[PDB]
Amino acid sequence: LIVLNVSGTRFQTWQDTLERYPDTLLGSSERDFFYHPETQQYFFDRDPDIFRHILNFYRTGKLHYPRHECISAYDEELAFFGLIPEIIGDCCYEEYKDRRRENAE
Template sequence: MVEESNEKINTSEKINTNERIILNVGGVKYETYRSTLTAYPETLLGTMFQERNQSLLQPTNNNEYFFDRDGHLFRYIMQFYRTGEIFWPNESYFSDYSTFYG
């Protein structure tokens, strides 16, 4: 009986898949939709933002999540979530640090 009532509570608390999420990655902020991240449920971010994990999330400023990683390189990860394609520039692109920090 207890399980049934908890299940009803959980299913009634549907999350908004169009909710805007801010990912603060090493100080660089990326804004996207929850649905963009959950479109790939087998990934870390896809799993993290699934409805079933909502109670485990601890945002700052209501919808911002901090990751201590390289924020400039994270843009390639966001590009994958948005397009479904992996883009990785050639080595000469990375030889000029001003591309990232200029």
């Protein structure tokens, strides 16, 4: 089990799970830069709520978008972790698309 500590919030996943998408922060060597030997875990000073959506992506290969979250904050987390371009699931695509436009008016 890999421990991904995001601003105090403990997340845990498998190395194999993350390796599913090389070519992202967590699935590549970029992750090494955030490791803390002393604690045997990776630390990220990022938003712990939005991170749930980042991690979930590794299992489904799909992204869900939380309506209640700010679209800018959401996109920033995707950009940071390398989920680019964003592959939003059909279930969430329209709302994400609509919010992006509204935010850009």
